[PDB]
């Protein structure tokens, strides 16, 4: 592992960040002082959920809660393939992270994000309560249930 | 700014807490916004990720581009060398260590301090723990402030339960408790400080001397903050017996006397108060086991003091037989056992250690020359501090004085017969062998009482409000016929119990007749010594004279009735006696005390007093 | 923003196509 960390090959270190992510070694990746890994995540954060989650962990441990709430909220409003329940977790985290002070950011900007995440989380829970009840309902034909699961187990719908 | 880093976030947060503490509520809306952004910080007090090999080998393999979170940075042969150096000195992860160094380049503090880049990382790392821990003390301190709005006082209270102690609020709700994390947290500070001296001493045996001194200061401050946080948490009845046993074992395994022991003293005091005294876990059965458990020690004075405090605090149960159950238990045997244990603790030097700690706590760089040699004529056998620059705080001193006054009240209201028998034993010992110096237990105890009651008139008034209480009873009983040391200790106590004018007037009215000490005997002894010197003198007589002069000066500076009476009293004529004593062959201390007494008497005077003073001066100088 | 429109929906109790 010395030979690994003693390298200056950049495509290599990118390939190793991806490999650590694959194997699940949050142990070793979260323990890198470097910003090089943060910058690498900032480009692909809004591309994949698993990468965004890593980026948000780096922000939170650095008391940058508002920036994580921003990543999580945009991810919940996006058209990436994300389940409704995963979008409930993202909003719930963003709601908490925007409710606490982050230095350098105005109280107004925090509250406006904490409010957008609170409303979207309220709608998401309604949608989750619906989807669950509809799937379990004995009086609903199977043919329709599959159709319900397609349109409700994804991005959050209007009221 | 708005996008502040971890360091700037804690530094700004600290300023806000000081505002609310200094009666400035202009940042209420801004304060709540910070606690939510640093929620993950308050959860873990102090935790450094272990040095991993995955980052060590990867950092040096491709030191070209670094990705931390969302931003990206470029590593060069110069910066990469600082990461490995910082990680080795502090044993910190390469990823976390790199982030610290990156924060310095952005803020650009290398020019503000003109130091190597790798050294700044050590300071920046210590600053985080300082504010991260120091800010917690302000939260609990403000949550207990009674001079603020009740609503705001409760906001910081519930917040600390969840942010610091990890306890959710009442309106909601695998995890580890706070104490076990705090104990392990303080442990890391000790191991880190120990390894620091070993490595530092090796290379020393440079431009980093001041940095090492600042790091040691930050470490001791963080340890004091952790101790205060632990004390506050224990004050909320959030402990158990396992933590108490662990703390007792850690104390038994104590090696050297330093500031850490003085910081932990109040922790054990609060532990005994919550468990030993009937003001907490009032399980009488549980207290019996702890008594035998407390009653191996690498320092006997510590065990003696602990046993004395435990006995003093636990003797409050056996006062009456109506508030608790005391059936099928003998009293005389337990009383004799506690008495012999307290006597053994005294012989081992419990009060001596307490007095040495109290003295070392208020160690001041400079002292007023009007009180030189006061309370410094005993036989101190306890080793002193190494004199390193580790100044104490104010809240710690306040808590120490409060605990000492509480212990004094308990010992006075629970063990009067013990003090009586000790005084009689000392008297008979001094009588059967005057050539030898008996023990100074009572004098040391009175000096500790004086140190406890200093600059606190709210507590000193208790000795004058109720003249029929136990406090006034002991005050009047300690004024009977005794030796020079006891009289000097009582005079010093009276002098220190005159922080204001009301207490000074009360002491004046209580000293004069309305047997206990009276001004008549004082002036008689003064005239006797004057005639003896003018027709040798022992240290005890000089000490008594100096104590009398200091007491008179204090009463004249604090009280007005005494200043107006003694100045023109025909039966005393203190001025003539002090002048006849000063014109004699005596050391300079007595002359200085007489001059200070004259100054105090002449602090507020009129034309007639000025004329009389000038007449006396001319008559005695011509 | 809510807008009720009972007019044209999709029969929740009939399959598609």
Rounded Cα distance, B213 and B58, in Å: 34
Do residues A127 and A157 lie in contact, with contact meaning Cβ atoms separated by under 8 Å? yes
Among candidates B54, B60, B70 on the partner chain, residue whose Cβ is nearest the Cβ of A38: B70
Is the distance from CB of B447 to CB of B489 less than 8 angstroms?
A: yes
Alpha-carbon distance of B251 to B233, in angstroms, equals 20
DSSP string, A123-145: HHHHHHHHHHHHHH-TTS-HHHH
Other beta carbons less than 10 A from residue A92's beta carbon? 17
Q: Look-up: residue for tokens 């301190």?
A: B141
Rounded Cα distance between B590 and B542, Å, is 8
Q: How many CB atoms lie within 10 A of CB B241?
A: 13
Interface test with chain B among A1, A2, A5, A54, by most B beta carbons within 10 Å: A5
Examine chains B and A and say if they touch (3+ CB pairs below 8 A).
yes
Closest CA to B159 of B25, B32, B40: B32
- Rg of chain A on CA atoms, in Å: 19
Contact between B523 and B577 under an 8 Å Cβ cutoff? The reply is: yes
Torsion angle, alpha carbons of B244, B247, B248, B249, to 10: 120
Chain A residues within 8 Å of chain C (Cβ atoms): 140-141, 143-144, 147, 158-159
Q: Which residues of C touch A158 (CB under 8 A)?
A: 1-2
Strand partners of residue B67: A36, B72
> Which among A4, A45, A100 has CB closest to B37?
A100
Joined tokens for residue B96: 């976390």
B227: burial class by Cβ within 10 Å (0-12, 13-18, 19+)? buried
Nearest CA in chain A to B71: A39
The yes-or-no reply on B/C contact (3 CB pairs or more, < 8 Å) is: no
Which of A144, A145, A152, A156 has the highest number of chain C CBs within 10 A, making it the mutation to test binding with C?
A144
Please choose, from the candidates B430, B372, B419, B350, the residue with its C-alpha nearest in 3D space to the C-alpha of residue B591.
B372
Interface contacts A/B by beta carbons within 8 Å: 243
B36/A25 touch (CB, cutoff 8 Å), yes or no: no
CA dihedral B506, B508, B509, B511 (to 10 degrees): 120
Reported for B393-402, long-range contacts at CB under 8 A and 24+ positions apart, including other chains, are: B393/B224, B395/B137, B395/B141, B395/B228, B396/B224, B396/B228, B396/B263, B396/B266, B396/B361, B397/B361, B397/B362, B399/B228, B399/B231, B399/B266, B400/B265, B400/B266, B400/B358, B400/B361, B401/B451, B401/B452, B401/B454, B401/B456
Extract the tokens encoding B474. Answer: 């002991």
Beta-bridge partner residues of B2? A104
Q: Which of B11, B60, B67 to mutate to test the interface with A (most CBs of A within 10 A)?
A: B67
**Tokens (6 digits) for B80:** 């990469």
In angstroms, what separates the C-alpha of C15 from chain A's closest C-alpha? 6
- Do B395 and B228 touch, CB atoms closer than 8 A? yes
Q: Please report the resolution in angstroms.
A: 37.0
Looking at beta carbons, which residues of chain A come within 8 Å of C2?
158-159
């Amino acid at each position: 592992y010395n030979v690994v960390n003693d390298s200056s090959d950049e495509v290599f270190h990118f390939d190793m960040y991806e490999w650590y992510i694959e194997k699940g070694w949050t142990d070793r990746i979260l323990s890198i002082d470097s910003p090089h890994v943060i910058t690498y995540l900032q480009r692909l954060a809004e591309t994949d959920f698993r990468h965004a989650e890593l980026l948000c962990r780096f922000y939170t441990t650095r008391s940058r809660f508002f920036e994580a709430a921003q990543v999580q909220t945009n991810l919940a409003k996006s058209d990436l393939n994300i389940s409704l329940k995963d979008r409930i977790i993202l909003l719930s985290r963003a709601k908490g992270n925007a409710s606490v002070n982050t230095i350098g950011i105005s109280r107004q900007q925090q509250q406006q994000l904490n409010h957008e995440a609170s409303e979207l989380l309220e709608i998401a829970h309604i949608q989750d309560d619906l989807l669950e009840r509809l799937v379990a309902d004995p009086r609903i034909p199977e043919e329709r249930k599959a159709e319900i699961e397609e349109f409700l187990d994804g991005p959050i719908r209007t009221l | 700014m708005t996008d502040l880093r971890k360091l700037e976030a804690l530094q700004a947060l600290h300023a806000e807490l000081v505002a609310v503490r200094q009666h400035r509520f202009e940042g209420l809306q801004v304060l709540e916004t910070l606690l939510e952004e640093q929620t993950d910080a308050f959860k873990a007090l102090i935790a450094k990720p272990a040095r991993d090999t995955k980052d060590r080998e990867a950092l040096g393999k491709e030191p070209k581009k670094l990705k931390i979170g969302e931003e990206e940075y470029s590593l060069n042969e110069d910066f990469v060398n600082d990461c490995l150096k910082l990680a080795d000195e502090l044993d910190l992860n390469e990823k976390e260590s790199a982030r610290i160094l990156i924060d310095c380049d952005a803020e650009g503090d290398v020019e503000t301090q003109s130091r190597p880049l790798w050294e700044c990382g050590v300071i920046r790392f210590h600053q985080e723990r300082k504010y991260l821990l120091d800010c917690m003390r302000l939260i609990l301190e403000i949550a207990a402030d009674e001079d603020i709005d009740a609503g705001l006082q409760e906001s910081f209270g519930v917040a600390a339960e969840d942010k610091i102690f990890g306890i959710p609020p009442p309106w909601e709700r695998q995890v580890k408790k706070f104490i076990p994390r705090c104990m392990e947290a303080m442990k890391g500070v000790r191991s880190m400080l120990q390894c620091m001296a070993d490595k530092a001493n090796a290379r020393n045996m440079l431009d980093n001397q001041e940095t090492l001194d600042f790091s040691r200061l930050s470490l001791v401050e963080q340890h004091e903050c952790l101790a205060s946080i632990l004390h506050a948490a224990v004050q909320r009845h959030h402990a158990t017996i396992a933590d108490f046993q662990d703390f007792i074992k850690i104390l038994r395994k104590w090696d050297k006397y330093d500031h850490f022991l003085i910081h932990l003293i109040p922790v054990l005091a609060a532990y005994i108060t919550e468990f030993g005294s009937p003001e907490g876990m009032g399980d009488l059965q549980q207290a019996r086991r702890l008594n035998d458990f407390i009653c191996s020690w690498a320092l006997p004075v510590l065990g003696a003091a602990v046993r004395a405090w435990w006995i003093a605090e636990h003797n409050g149960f056996y006062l009456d037989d109506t508030v608790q159950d005391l059936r099928g238990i003998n009293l005389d045997e337990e009383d004799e056992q506690r008495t012999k244990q307290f006597l053994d603790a005294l012989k081992e030097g419990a009060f001596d250690f307490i007095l040495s700690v109290a003295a070392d706590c208020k160690a001041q760089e400079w002292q007023d020359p009007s009180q030189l040699g006061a309370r410094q004529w005993l036989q101190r056998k306890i080793p002193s501090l190494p004199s390193e620059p580790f100044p104490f705080s104010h809240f710690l001193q306040h808590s120490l004085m409060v605990h000492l006054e509480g212990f004094v009240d308990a010992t006075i209201s629970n063990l009067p017969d013990v003090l009586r028998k000790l005084r009689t034993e000392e008297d008979e010992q001094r009588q059967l062998r005057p050539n030898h110096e008996q023990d100074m237990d009572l004098e040391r105890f009175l000096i500790i009482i004086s140190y406890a009651y200093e600059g606190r008139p709210d507590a000193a008034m208790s000795f004058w409000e109720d003249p029929d209480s136990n406090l006034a009873g002991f005050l009047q009983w300690a004024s009977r016929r005794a030796s020079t040391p006891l009289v000097s200790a009582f005079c010093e106590m009276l002098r220190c119990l005159a922080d204001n004018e009301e207490c000074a007037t009360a002491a004046h009215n209580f000293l004069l007749d309305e047997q206990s000490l009276t001004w008549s005997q004082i002036f008689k002894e003064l005239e006797y010594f004057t005639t003896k010197v003018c027709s040798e003198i022992e240290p005890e007589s000089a000490l008594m004279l100096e104590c009398y002069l200091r007491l008179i000066a204090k009463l004249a500076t604090e009280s007005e009735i005494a200043r107006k009476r003694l100045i023109m009293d025909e039966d005393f004529n203190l001025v003539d006696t002090i002048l006849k004593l000063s014109v004699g062959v005596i050391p300079h201390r007595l002359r200085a005390c007489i001059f200070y007494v004259l100054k105090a008497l002449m602090i507020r005077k009129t034309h007639e007093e000025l004329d009389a003073m000038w007449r006396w001066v001319e008559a005695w100088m011509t | 923003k809510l807008v009720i429109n009972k007019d044209m929906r999709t029969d929740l109790f009939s399959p598609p196509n």
